[PDB]
Amino acid sequence: QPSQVGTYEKILTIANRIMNGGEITKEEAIELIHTSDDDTMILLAMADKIRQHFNDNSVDVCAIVNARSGKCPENCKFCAQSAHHNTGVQEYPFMDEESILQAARKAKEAGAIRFSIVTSGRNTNNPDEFDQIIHVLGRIKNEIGLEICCSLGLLTYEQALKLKEVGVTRYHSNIETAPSHFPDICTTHSYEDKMFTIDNAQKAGIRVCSGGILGLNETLEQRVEMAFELKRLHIDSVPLNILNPVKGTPFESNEALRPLDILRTFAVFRFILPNALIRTAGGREVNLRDLQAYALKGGLNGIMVGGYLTTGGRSPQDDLQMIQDLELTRNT
Amino acid sequence: GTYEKILTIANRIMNGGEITKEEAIELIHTSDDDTMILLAMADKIRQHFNDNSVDVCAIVNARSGKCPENCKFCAQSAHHNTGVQEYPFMDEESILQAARKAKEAGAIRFSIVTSGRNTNNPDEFDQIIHVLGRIKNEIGLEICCSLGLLTYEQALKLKEVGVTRYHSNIETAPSHFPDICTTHSYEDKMFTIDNAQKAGIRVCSGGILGLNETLEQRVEMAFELKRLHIDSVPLNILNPVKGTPFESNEALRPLDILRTFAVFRFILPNALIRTAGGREVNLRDLQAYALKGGLNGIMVGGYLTTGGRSPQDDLQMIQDLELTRN
Ligand SMILES: C[S@@+](CC[C@H](N)C(=O)[O-])C[C@H]1O[C@@H](n2cnc3c(N)ncnc32)[C@H](O)[C@@H]1O
Ligand SMILES: C[S@@+](CC[C@H](N)C(=O)[O-])C[C@H]1O[C@@H](n2cnc3c(N)ncnc32)[C@H](O)[C@@H]1O
Ligand SMILES: C[C@@H]1NC(=O)N[C@@H]1CCCCCC(=O)O
Ligand SMILES: C[C@@H]1NC(=O)N[C@@H]1CCCCCC(=O)O
Ligand code: SF4
Ligand code: SF4
Ligand code: NA
Numbered sequence: 097q098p099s100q101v102g103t104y105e106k107i108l109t110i111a112n113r114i115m116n117g118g119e120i121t122k123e124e125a126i127e128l129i130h131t132s133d134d135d136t137m138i139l140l141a142m143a144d145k146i147r148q149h150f151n152d153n154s155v156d157v158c159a160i161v162n163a164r165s166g167k168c169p170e171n172c173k174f175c176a177q178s179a180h181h182n183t184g185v186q187e188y189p190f191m192d193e194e195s196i197l198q199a200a201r202k203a204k205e206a207g208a209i210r211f212s213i214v215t216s217g218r219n220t221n222n223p224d225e226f227d228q229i230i231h232v233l234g235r236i237k238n239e240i241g242l243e244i245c246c247s248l249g250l251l252t253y254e255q256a257l258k259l260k261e262v263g264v265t266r267y268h269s270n271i272e273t274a275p276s277h278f279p280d281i282c283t284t285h286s287y288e289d290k291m292f293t294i295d296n297a298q299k300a301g302i303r304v305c306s307g308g309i310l311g312l313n314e315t316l317e318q319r320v321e322m323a324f325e326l327k328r329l330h331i332d333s334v335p336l337n338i339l340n341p342v343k344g345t346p347f348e349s350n351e352a353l354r355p356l357d358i359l360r361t362f363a364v365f366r367f368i369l370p371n372a373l374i375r376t377a378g379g380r381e382v383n384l385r386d387l388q389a390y391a392l393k394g395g396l397n398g399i400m401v402g403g404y405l406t407t408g409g410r411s412p413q414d415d416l417q418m419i420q421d422l423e424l425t426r427n428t
Numbered sequence: 429g430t431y432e433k434i435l436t437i438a439n440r441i442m443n444g445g446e447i448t449k450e451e452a453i454e455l456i457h458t459s460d461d462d463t464m465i466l467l468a469m470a471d472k473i474r475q476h477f478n479d480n481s482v483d484v485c486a487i488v489n490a491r492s493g494k495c496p497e498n499c500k501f502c503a504q505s506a507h508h509n510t511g512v513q514e515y516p517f518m519d520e521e522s523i524l525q526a527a528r529k530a531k532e533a534g535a536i537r538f539s540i541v542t543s544g545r546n547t548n549n550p551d552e553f554d555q556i557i558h559v560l561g562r563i564k565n566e567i568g569l570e571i572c573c574s575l576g577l578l579t580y581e582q583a584l585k586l587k588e589v590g591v592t593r594y595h596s597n598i599e600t601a602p603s604h605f606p607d608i609c610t611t612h613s614y615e616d617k618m619f620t621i622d623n624a625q626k627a628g629i630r631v632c633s634g635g636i637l638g639l640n641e642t643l644e645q646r647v648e649m650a651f652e653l654k655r656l657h658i659d660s661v662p663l664n665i666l667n668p669v670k671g672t673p674f675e676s677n678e679a680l681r682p683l684d685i686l687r688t689f690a691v692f693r694f695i696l697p698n699a700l701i702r703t704a705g706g707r708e709v710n711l712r713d714l715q716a717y718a719l720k721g722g723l724n725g726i727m728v729g730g731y732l733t734t735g736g737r738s739p740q741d742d743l744q745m746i747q748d749l750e751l752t753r754n
Contacts, residue, residue, distance in 0.1 A: 099439060099440075099443050100439075100442070100443055101439075102439065102442070102472065104472070108435070112429070133480075133750040134471075134472070134475050134480075136720075137464070137467060137468035137471045137472075137720050137721070138465075138468045138472070140464060140468070141464035141465045141467070141468045142465075144464050145431075145461075145464075145465070148461055153461075354748075354750065355748040355749075356748075356749070356750055384748075385744060385745070385748055386713065386715065386716045386741065386744070386745045386748065387716050387745075387748055387749070388713065389713045389714050389716065389717070390716070390717070393463075393464050394464075414713065417712060417713070418712070418713045418714075421681075421682045421683075421712055421713065421714055422682075422683070422714070423460040423681070423683055
């Protein structure tokens with residue numbers, strides 16, 4: 097005479113606990129990231145409910161420009177732009193400011209409300225390039241009216257002050273993977289170098305955007321470790337890339353993830369970080385295909401449009417239509 | 429928990445119970461915020477009573493235009509100026525070429541579809557029988573057909589040649605049928621369904637969302653399919669045709685469509701429920717939601733007077749949802 101309960105009850109219980117002020121434990125998150133295919137839609141649904149409980153129904157749209165491309169001394173095993181790997185990538189110096197402003201203007205027409213200057217290379221060690229970056233970041237913000245981001249690699253405290261002064265509101269630095277996996281993906285810089293960078297940005301009063309890449313041979317457990325590590329670092333802006341394997345790099349042959357594995361991972365990040373702005377970045381179109389729309393009703397509330405650094409995306413108008421079709425709104 | 433009743437009703441159904449009309453009306457009004465819980469529960473009901481396969485079908489427009497029926501939605505009606513291609517029953521070799529293409533595209537079954545009230549000329553009908561035979565026996569697809577109003581004697585002949593699905597949409601709820609057609613009636617459809625069933629053929633019957641029905645009428649439509657023991661249900665979404673009285677009907681919101689699909693699954697837990705016409709146009713990048721939100725079949729390869737996307741994309745999507753084919 098007791099009704100039979102479904103396999104997905106724990107998902108409901110935990111979601112309720114979080115929406116009532118509790119927190120998921122590591123063991124719980126590990127269980128949830130192993131959710132079945134059959135129960136995945138309940139997990140995604142409950143992530144969407146957590147998202148709604150702690151945030152509005154807006155989707156934050158960003159876009160980037162590869163303002164300086166290729167020729168990087170770092171050996172990050174996934175990156176097209178490393179010198180240790182022949183990938184046939186475009187190489188060029190810092191774009192001229194009018195060219196950058198054009199891209200800024202296109203990103204705004206496309207529906208981005210914030211825009212990142214991204215450069216290859218460890219850091220920006222020449223103080224003249226840095227100065228050019230500051231100059232054009234200012235023009236973007238004051239003349240185009242976009243919030244400004246940047247991804248400049250390793251960052252000193254003095255640089256972060258300057259970024260803060262010119263009006264940067266997100267400083268991007270990805271942890272890439274779980275601390276326990278970072279040695280297996282890069283050796284020319286360390287995890288510690290990422291901590292320094294992130295700390296320096298935070299101490300200058302800049303909200304840090306930090307995430308990483310699913311599909312680097314991390315275990316599911318390590319994806320959970322990565323989320324809690326972001327929690328530790330007080331990160332509330334999280335871009336989740338999915339590896340786009342680059343011919344010539346060592347991760348060329350990395351096995352593709354199953355779309356539902358990716359979507360489950362997104363949902364579990366939401367459970368672990370209920371108040372964060374969590375977004376897709378690289379690899380969305382190619383690795384989620386016709387399931388991309390699941391992300392924004394499965395725990396994510398941001399999207400990078402207009403393509404990436406050395407890899408493309410779909411038309412941003414299709415992305416704006418998808419947001420509308422999901423009955424979500426566009427931020428700011 | 430604003431979505432608690434969704435969970436309770438779903439669990440009741442999976443423990444052997446039935447949704448009430450009143451409850452179905454409430455569920456079809458689920459908020460946007462609660463829509464994913466509804467789709468999830470419909471996915472659980474689909475899994476509980478069926479399996480994890482997606483049935484892939486395709487069609488050919490074998491005879492086009494010049495229909496004396498005045499269905500307000502239909503491009504092939506003669507009462508409406510619509511610019512539709514008109515042609516009599518296609519030649520065997522063309523039809524077989526279309527069937528080969530469908531099979532290559534991943535369809536397990538294939539429908540000869542005709543404009544018209546019916547086929548009255550017994551010779552034209554035998555031509556239909558002849559080619560149905562060659563499709564099944566030579567190309568090796570299961571065979572469906574959609575020939576309009578059907579007599580018992582016609583149904584026996586289709587059974588004999590090996591037709592495994594006879595298609596005849598009810599289109600809408602009985603209470604809305606007069607508002608879409610007056611050259612034939614709702615009861616005309618009821619005789620056709622009975623005739624096909626009594627000959628031993630599984631009937632495939634659904635209809636069209638977006639014909640100005642109320643949400644309540646969509647529920648009525650599902651309950652009628654329930655009463656009729658229909659277990660193969662194609663859910664079309666109106667593609668408004670220029671020149672028809674419904675050319676200016678408003679598009680439905682994707683989530684409204686998906687909520688409707690989910691509610692049909694709650695009412696018909698055991699049924700093979702598929703998308704048909706207007707899927708790509710009206711669901712766009714939310715099409716994938718249907719197969720993890722209550723549906724378990726898909727029509728690929730485009731329609732009668734309207735196209736579809738690449739079937740390979742459709743097959744990839746099935747695979748990406750961790751579903752199988754058969
Ligand atoms: C951070 S930007 C370059 C700026 C600077 N060099 C740095 O390392 O911060 C390059 C970022 O794109 C992502 N990325 C690079 N190659 C990728 C690939 N093949 N697939 C997916 N994401 C990738 C990584 O997460 C990486 O943090
Ligand atoms: C049923 S077949 C034609 C065979 C036969 N004349 C009959 O009415 O049964 C045509 C089917 O396509 C669907 N259909 C027609 N025009 C449509 C449109 N504009 N949008 C969506 N579905 C449509 C209807 O459900 C209709 O039953
Ligand atoms: C820098 C942006 N922020 C982020 O987390 N990834 C974006 C870049 C992704 C690059 C994808 C691979 C390529 O285009 O080379
Ligand atoms: C006959 C098939 N089965 C069904 O229920 N609908 C299909 C036809 C869809 C037609 C869409 C509009 C057109 O192409 O004219
Ligand atoms: S991710 Fe950054 S640091 Fe690593 S190789 Fe690419 S450009 Fe260099
Ligand atoms: S009976 Fe069939 S072909 Fe004729 S108008 Fe109606 S749907 Fe169109
Ligand atoms: Na389903």
